[PDB]
Design an enzyme around this catalytic site. Structure first.
Site, PDB file in Angstrom:
ATOM      1  N   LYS A   1     -69.249  23.871 -17.625  1.00  0.00           N
ATOM      2  CA  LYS A   1     -68.321  23.118 -18.531  1.00  0.00           C
ATOM      3  C   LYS A   1     -68.344  22.692 -19.745  1.00  0.00           C
ATOM      4  CE  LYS A   1     -64.802  22.103 -15.821  1.00  0.00           C
ATOM      5  NZ  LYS A   1     -64.589  23.379 -15.708  1.00  0.00           N
TER       6      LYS A   1
ATOM      7  N   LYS B   1     -72.391  30.310 -13.184  1.00  0.00           N
ATOM      8  CA  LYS B   1     -71.034  30.926 -13.595  1.00  0.00           C
ATOM      9  C   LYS B   1     -70.263  30.971 -15.071  1.00  0.00           C
ATOM     10  CE  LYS B   1     -66.160  30.525 -12.138  1.00  0.00           C
ATOM     11  NZ  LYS B   1     -64.796  28.990 -12.536  1.00  0.00           N
TER      12      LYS B   1
ATOM     13  N   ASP C   1     -66.967  30.738 -16.795  1.00  0.00           N
ATOM     14  CA  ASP C   1     -64.889  30.314 -16.378  1.00  0.00           C
ATOM     15  C   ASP C   1     -64.829  31.882 -16.354  1.00  0.00           C
ATOM     16  OD1 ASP C   1     -64.177  27.734 -16.190  1.00  0.00           O
ATOM     17  OD2 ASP C   1     -62.471  28.928 -17.412  1.00  0.00           O
ATOM     18  N   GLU C   2     -63.819  31.614 -15.478  1.00  0.00           N
ATOM     19  CA  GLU C   2     -62.723  32.770 -15.072  1.00  0.00           C
ATOM     20  C   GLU C   2     -61.984  33.141 -16.648  1.00  0.00           C
ATOM     21  OE1 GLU C   2     -62.220  30.435 -13.558  1.00  0.00           O
ATOM     22  OE2 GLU C   2     -61.064  28.820 -14.147  1.00  0.00           O
TER      23      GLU C   2
ATOM     24  N   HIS D   1     -63.421  36.096  -8.610  1.00  0.00           N
ATOM     25  CA  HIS D   1     -62.059  35.684  -8.523  1.00  0.00           C
ATOM     26  C   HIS D   1     -61.242  34.960  -8.558  1.00  0.00           C
ATOM     27  CE1 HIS D   1     -61.195  31.228 -10.364  1.00  0.00           C
ATOM     28  NE2 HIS D   1     -62.052  30.874 -10.642  1.00  0.00           N
TER      29      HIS D   1
ATOM     30  N   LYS E   1     -58.675  18.062   3.662  1.00  0.00           N
ATOM     31  CA  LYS E   1     -57.846  18.984   4.169  1.00  0.00           C
ATOM     32  C   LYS E   1     -57.191  18.932   5.735  1.00  0.00           C
ATOM     33  CE  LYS E   1     -57.504  23.229   1.691  1.00  0.00           C
ATOM     34  NZ  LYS E   1     -55.823  23.449   1.244  1.00  0.00           N
TER      35      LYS E   1
END
Lengths: 457, 123, 123, 457
Positions: free
Chosen positions: A158, A184, A186-187, A277, A317
């Site tokens: 990030k 990763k 970022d998409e 992704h 959840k």
């Protein structure tokens, strides 16, 4: 157009080669269920209001979709589950693009319906065999990486958009050297003014090789190959191959199925792992009344091809939603998944040895969530952190160490016979004793859950 | 605030970020394999304890993944002490070797366990 | 006429052709960063002090450019002595390491400073 | 042909998408300014003396260049500045070749004018986005080379033409091993009887790798890829890529924009830095009354593509000329350059993140000029020496050491708060104490400026 008397066939016995579809139908007032379900079958196959001469130069009853069953939904009224059967011949071999065009191409816009939602699809073994599926799959991937007995660990770099190629690589090295297996892209990070793709691939390769040399463990960085055209996309993967890196990445829904299948084929032929992704999925799969449930989008990815796929998070959840998630997670990893309406599985799905896909759990995951995640998902999963690594007080490496130590503490405890469900918090507490990195990451958490701290001796 | 060491912190995958397993903990891990029906097996290495890339650098290729097998997979093994005994014998014969215990699953032709049991001096 | 030595004259970029910076000069350099609003950060390396090419030899690729970060970038730092203190702590923990101070610019996501602060024995 | 009543439009409000041009017009006696400026706009767009039937099958007022303003030049009489606006549609995307053909294609030969000079061009963001620009740019280049906090240093291998491949490499190694970052192929050196290109590339690669291994710093040599055809040019760059070297070179004006854009694209796709030499520029940009000012030729290079570009020297120039230079240097390096007529900047230029180009200062530069050069240009520049390295009494390496020491002394002094403008000579004097190499290079200079020498202790 009275479809009901031609497309609604409750006496129909489904064939082993049929593609079955479970639609959640919300018909317009006055429109009967049988007629609505027949309209769904009609529109997604032959689509005829009446008859034209060309229909006699073939057999309509050979290529038509058939609604063979209707079921009222227990909860809401005006909502039914229509089961449709499609002949194997309607579909092009190996093309998810054609499968989606035939089934979800025009029906969602039919007037007699107020809302329509594709809940599941039964892909018969005869159609499954026409697909390559994942370039490698769970087993081969663990073998290539030489990683066994625990979930894999990854982290996001990030901010999403903004960093330069060299700074991106720096964060990659720091995270990986601390105990993480993957980092990763970022998409959204493809190729932009602030950071062109080739520079990123080059610096990230340097960073991942250094961390691998330093730690002695195999490292990987999902290098995003998503692009404007198929040619650019392949051109990007080709360079990843030249650098000798293990894994590339693709946004299958925004990139598209035609492009994704091409990349998947390329990855199989060149030994590259493919991380998928699911960007843009929520515009399609969020509303309970209209769209396509993620379990269908997940089945499509497993057929088109991908070794990993983002499948959300289970943190916060209700069992309920958690059961639905475990439902599609099984559909992605297992070879045979028996019908089970309690977990949203409308059909028994036989994958006939098609490789399984590794589910990736991400979204507000912190170290103290490790016990529950390890128990819910099991070893065959990839757990991704964002602020749990980057947001660690001491930085990326110590943040990566904290997550690696926390995960291994959970694995050890599980193997020793401990219940992760009720001893979770205690397991992390004990681990904080032998890990300054883990302790610093658990500060605010200790104050609330344990009302302290500390250590002793 | 502490700095994570860039040297002398070489790892061996699963469980290597935890303090060295005591004989009792090492024994509990072996019992997990047996309880699940997994076939235990020992592997050791004397030269290359970590992966490298000498013969090829194409995607997915690394040298040093394969280690040498200690005897044979222990099929039908029901006592976790038999396994622990072999580790003692192995380090007795090769004290300068890294030794790890792996587990094999049959429903799946796969390996599903791999943790270090012994590390040579200065590791 | 003198001959420039082909050995024992390894460099570390900016300022390395000048005599070793005295603590006072080292401190003046750090104040230049602060006066310009640049975020100071320390990096150190114990093994490869110079660039090499082991993993790839394509244009622009070199191994050894990245060093390991000492803690975190010192945002909000206003005293140049705080920075100088970290160099002492770093060489105390890793005497055999090369240590350098780098500076980051935000208008530009770039690094814009990099000079050696400490070199190991015989360098 | 009375253009004035159709091409001279003082009421015109320029659009964000217009290409603006500032021409310095010297009309023939009797020809009014408004008519001259209208002739300039007319000729460089639709070019019509009157009307033909085809002009009705379109809208003339849609593709015409418009002179919207005239300004008398303060200095000389009979000299005006005509501002012309061109529609975005007149230009081919990504083609500097087309931009130059449309604007400077025929107007310079118009009879109503005695002389014409293109002073500046406002390239709108909408046209800028159709260009790739520099293969890498300032920031990426520093990151690839791992060089920060100081100007880069280069030197020319002399004689220009004449040396053999192995001797060329020898001088390359000696210069680079002494502290220089780059060495340069002469712009004339391509492939000739005395030295074929491939042999040069081969020996220069051996030399630069040895110096890099010896010093521990990344080295580069501008390998000239300029050639008779596009195919030969690419063939030369391909070999540089095979050798794994960091930078190639091209003479963009003699080679041409079409060929330069091709090379730039190749360099982006293959990670090669591109050094640009401005050979032949003075036949176009020297005279104040006729031609094209270098600032336009520099803008064209930044669009076509190049990571470095020769931009002359500032030594021995009146502020005046120095201000003009700093004007185009900003246009090459910065993202946004506001209008400023004092530095010859007729238009505000927004580069919308197009990478910046590193200016290369060369021409009679000696060590004692280092203080002024470091202050004027700043860190983002490349300072090239010819006789300041080769002409050093002790040879290439000691000559390179002298320049490296002199530069670092200036950087250190600047960082310590010293004024390079007034303490320049003293800074070099102090440096001579700890550098025998620098002392030997400053002998004749010491005798004149300091009336001595020496050292003390």
């Amino acid at each position: 157009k009275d479809y009901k008397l031609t497309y609604y066939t409750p006496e129909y016995q489904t064939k082993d080669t049929d593609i079955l579809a479970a639609f959640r139908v919300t018909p317009q007032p006055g429109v009967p269920p049988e007629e609505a379900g027949a309209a769904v079958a009609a529109e997604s196959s032959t689509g005829t209001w009446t008859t034209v001469w060309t229909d006699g130069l073939t057999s309509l009853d050979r290529y038509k979709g058939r609604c063979y069953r209707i079921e009222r939904v227990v909860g809401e009224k005006d909502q039914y589950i229509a089961y449709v059967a499609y002949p194997l011949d309607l579909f092009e071999e190996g093309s998810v693009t054609n499968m989606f065009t035939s089934i979800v191409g025009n029906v969602f816009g039919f007037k007699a319906l107020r809302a329509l939602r594709l809940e599941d699809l039964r892909i018969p073994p005869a159609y499954v065999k026409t697909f390559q599926g994942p370039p490698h799959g769970i087993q081969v991937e663990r073998d290539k990486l030489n990683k066994y007995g625990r979930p894999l660990l990854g982290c996001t770099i990030k901010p999403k958009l903004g960093l330069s190629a060299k700074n991106y690589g720096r964060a990659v090295y720091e995270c990986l050297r601390g105990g993480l297996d993957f980092t990763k892209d970022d998409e959204n990070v493809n190729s932009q003014p602030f950071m062109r793709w080739r520079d990123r691939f080059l610096f990230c390769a340097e960073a991942l090789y250094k961390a691998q040399a330093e730690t002695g463990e195999i490292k990987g960085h999902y290098l995003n190959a998503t692009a404007g055209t198929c040619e650019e996309m392949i051109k990007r993967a080709v360079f990843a191959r030249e650098l000798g890196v293990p894994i590339v990445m693709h946004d299958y829904l925004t990139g598209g199925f035609t492009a994704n299948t091409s990349l998947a084929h390329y990855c199989r032929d060149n030994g590259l792992l493919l991380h998928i992704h699911r960007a843009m999925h929520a515009v399609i799969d969020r509303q309970k009344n209209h769209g396509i449930h993620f379990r269908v989008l997940a089945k499509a990815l497993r057929m088109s091809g991908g070794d990993h796929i983002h499948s959300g998070t289970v943190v916060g959840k209700l069992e309920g939603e958690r059961d639905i998630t475990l439902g599609f997670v099984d559909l992605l990893r297992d070879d045979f998944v028996e019908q089970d309406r309690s977990r949203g599985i409308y059909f028994t799905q036989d994958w006939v040895s098609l490789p399984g896909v590794l589910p990736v759990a991400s979204g507000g995951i912190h170290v103290w969530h490790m016990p529950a995640l390890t128990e819910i998902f099991g070893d065959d999963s990839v757990l991704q952190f964002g602020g749990g690594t980057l947001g660690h007080p001491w930085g990326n490496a110590p943040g990566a160490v904290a997550n690696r130590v926390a995960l291994e503490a959970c694995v050890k405890a599980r193997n020793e016979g401990r219940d992760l469900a009720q001893e979770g918090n205690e397991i992390i507490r004990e681990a904080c004793k032998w890990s300054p990195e883990l302790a610093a990451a658990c500060e605010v958490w200790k104050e609330i859950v344990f009302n302290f701290a500390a250590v002793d001796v | 605030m502490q700095v994570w060491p860039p040297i002398n912190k070489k790892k061996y995958e699963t469980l290597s970020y935890l303090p060295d397993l005591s004989q009792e903990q090492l024994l509990s891990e072996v019992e997990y394999l047996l309880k699940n029906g997994w076939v235990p097996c020992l592997e050791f290495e004397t030269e290359h304890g970590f992966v490298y890339r000498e013969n090829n650098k194409s995607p997915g290729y690394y040298d040093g993944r394969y280690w040498t097998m200690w005897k044979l997979p222990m099929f039908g093994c029901t006592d976790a002490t038999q396994v622990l005994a072999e580790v003692e014998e192995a380090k007795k014969a090769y004290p300068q070797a890294w030794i790890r215990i792996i587990g094999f699953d049959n429903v799946r032709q796969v390996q599903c366990i791999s943790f270090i049991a012994y590390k040579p001096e200065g590791y």
